[PDB]
Design a protein around this ligand. Structure first.
Ligand SMILES: CC1CCN(C(=O)NCc2ccco2)CC1
Ligand SMILES: CC1CCN(C(=O)NCc2ccco2)CC1
Lengths: 193, 193
């Protein structure tokens, strides 16, 4: 039951490593999961819907991991606090590069994917803003930009930069340099005048 | 000759304000330019090729405007130097929102568009880096990150942030706030420790 579903999900993720959604048939998804095409259609209405669920689970994994971090303060300086946070996204999406890459393209096409991404981005920006605001209240950050606007630009940087880097786009920050790069820009822009 | 070509370009830009490339036929492009479908095919192999040229001219306009700025130093502080520069991109792409939005989608699909964007981004990052390096040499900026990596992340921020803002995406920086937002993050990240 759940097992066939899990196998369709895993077959899909596997197949997205080597080629795009376009050049993957539900036929390929069925065989890989060891089921018929009709049986596939019982678990998912489409191949697009397989991607969506896959993306859903990556996004929830990131979020949950961020919630875990937020609940257990790490005994460290401001720079490592931010780093530890950004690293959740770096590791989680970096561990699911094929889904990441396919998700982001599907944003153009699928309203569900666009809305899924949109919902979580807003949540992560709201959280970034609350932390900046909290840093301003304790007197550790200067009151420069509207915290929420700053959080927005910083989150959008991370999205574009993390993903160009995982795709190996030209141009991009080398994947082994991208954490330090993003952390420097977060902390200088959050704490600097 | 050039006039029919110009009219196809303008018809296309006009039509992209109200709907995507997908829901624009070459038929619509021909009528709008006041020509036949066959005559259209003499000037352009496809509707995709119309977008590409349109994007080409926006991108060259931005570049040329940046070259003009680079050739005439403005008598001003570091913050306004960066602002004046980022503003070239804000105004130029912000004046061609339909082409911008369609260009960026076509990146997924068209290898020409992807390469066009890629070429110019590299050029703009190289230039940003040369300016950061020049600021480090005169002793106005600290030697923090690899200048080229910093330039890369900052350029990618601007691309994602400018465009989310012009599209009116959720989330985004309001278009009337996005200049100040980006300038703060450039200058704090370039000059800060
Ligand atoms: C405190 C956290 C909040 C979120 N964040 C971050 O990179 N979000 C942007 C993103 C999502 C997927 C790729 O990039 C790190 C800092
Ligand atoms: C000195 C310049 C260099 C380029 N730049 C910039 O925003 N480039 C990124 C971009 C292109 C299109 C949208 O965003 C402003 C600063």
């Amino acid at each position: 039951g759940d097992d066939r579903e899990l196998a369709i999900l895993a077959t899909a993720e596997n197949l997205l490593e080597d080629r795009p959604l376009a050049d993957i048939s539900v036929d390929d998804l069925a065989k890989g999961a060891g089921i018929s095409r009709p049986t596939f259609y019982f678990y998912f209405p489409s191949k697009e819907a397989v991607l969506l669920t896959l993306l859903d689970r990556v996004v929830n994994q990131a979020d949950m991991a961020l919630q875990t971090l937020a609940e257990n303060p790490a005994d460290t300086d401001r720079e490592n606090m931010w780093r530890t946070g950004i690293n959740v996204f770096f590791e989680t999406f970096g561990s699911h590069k094929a889904v990441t890459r396919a998700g982001q393209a599907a944003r153009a096409t699928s309203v569900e994917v666009a809305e899924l991404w949109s919902t979580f981005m807003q949540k992560w920006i709201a959280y970034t803003a609350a932390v900046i605001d909290a840093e301003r209240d304790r007197g550790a950050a200067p009151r420069t930009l509207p915290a929420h606007e700053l959080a927005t630009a910083l989150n959008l940087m991370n999205e574009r930069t993390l993903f160009a880097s995982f795709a190996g786009e030209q141009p991009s920050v080398p994947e082994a340099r991208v954490l330090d790069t993003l952390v420097h820009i977060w902390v200088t822009s959050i704490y600097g005048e």
